[PDB]
Amino acid sequence: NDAMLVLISYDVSFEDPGGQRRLRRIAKACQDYGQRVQYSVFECVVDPAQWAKLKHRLLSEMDKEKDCLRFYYLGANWRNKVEHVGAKPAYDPEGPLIL
Amino acid sequence: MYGNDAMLVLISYDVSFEDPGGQRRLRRIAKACQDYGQRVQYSVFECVVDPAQWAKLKHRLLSEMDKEKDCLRFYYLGANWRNKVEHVGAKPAYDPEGPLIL
Ligand SMILES: [Cl-]
Ligand code: NA
């Protein structure tokens, strides 16, 4: 199916030992699908098969009692629904602002 | 409640803590956003706003940010944001009582 963008907000206490480990694992899982717009906010462009696989990984890595994941479904036309103002994102500043 | 023309904007404020200004700007931006929704991360905000409200809020946010040091990204979830947001796990620390989704 058509690729869509999911914006993933991972609310984790990263300065805590476990939180740091879980964030690293979640960041690694998300990395090649898009870009890291904050330390724990990820954009992932995914078709249906990719998203089913990815979502399962993320839910497995998080601690459901301590952390929370929020998914924002921007759809296939995410480009028409995202706006960037200001400095380039710290991560991959050479890439496009919008995926 | 909200009007039928209300929509959700998810605001990611990638703010620089290189100097004390960052925390100040974040405090101002958080305050501007607080009236319209909830704070889902330290610098990620949800705001439910109609067109006129958004025009005013957006202008305020752009004026408070430092455009050289910081970045603001706006994600326009539309009038049907409720069908496009999913929460898993613990309640948000800011406004832990309220609904998970506005
Ligand atoms: Cl922290
Ligand atoms: Na960390």
Neighbours of ion ligand 2 (CB under 5 A): A 14, 20
- Is A2 labeled as ligand-binding? no
- Alpha carbon B82 to its chain centroid, in Å, reads 16
Q: Which of A47, A45, A27 shows the shortest CA–CA distance to A36?
A: A27
Whether B73 and A37 lie within 8 Å, measured CB to CB: yes
Q: Which two tokens stand for residue A85?
A: 């103002």
Q: Which of B11, B10, B21, B9 shows the shortest CA–CA distance to B71?
A: B11
Distance B59 CA to ligand 2 centre (A): 33
Q: Which of B43, B34, B72, B51 shows the shortest CA–CA distance to A9?
A: B43
* Cβ pair A33, A44 in contact under 8 A: yes
Rounded distance between C-alpha atoms, residue A73 and residue A65, angstroms: 23
Rounded distance between C-alpha atoms, residue B17 and residue A43, angstroms: 22
Closest CB to A69 among B67, B72, B89: B89
Rounded distance between C-alpha atoms, residue B87 and residue A42, angstroms: 15
H or E element: which one contains A9?
Answer: strand A4-11
Instruction: Report chain B residues touching chain A, CB-CB < 8 A.
Output: 10, 12, 14, 16, 40-41, 43-44, 62, 65-78, 84-93
H or E element: which one contains A35?
Answer: strand A34-38
Rounded distance between C-alpha atoms, residue B30 and residue B42, angstroms: 9
B85: buried, middle or exposed (CB in 10 Å: 19+, 13-18, 0-12)?
Answer: buried
* Residue A63: domain span: 1-99
Beta partners for A82?
B75
* Cβ pair B102, B39 in contact under 8 A: no
A25: buried, middle or exposed (CB in 10 Å: 19+, 13-18, 0-12)?
Answer: middle
Question: What backbone torsions phi and psi does residue A59 show, to the nearest 5 degrees?
Answer: -65, -30
Structural domains counted in chain A: 1
Residue whose tokens read 């949800």: B46
Q: Which two tokens stand for residue B4?
A: 């039928």
H or E element: which one contains A87?
Answer: none
Q: Which CATH number does the domain housing residue A30 bear?
A: 3.30.70.240
Number of helical H runs and strand E runs in chain A: 2, 5
Whether B12 and A38 lie within 8 Å, measured CB to CB: yes
Q: Which two tokens stand for residue B40?
A: 């889902």
Q: Give SS3 for B22.
A: helix
Q: Smallest CA–CA separation between B78 and chain A, in Å?
A: 9
Side chain identity at residue A24, one-letter code: R
Around Cβ B46, how many Cβ atoms within 10 Å? 24
Closest CB to A68 among B12, B73, B87: B87
Sort out which chain A residues have CB atoms less than 8 A from B66's CB and list them. Answer: 86
Contacts of residue B2, defined as CB under 8 A and 6 or more positions apart, other chains included, come to: B48, B50
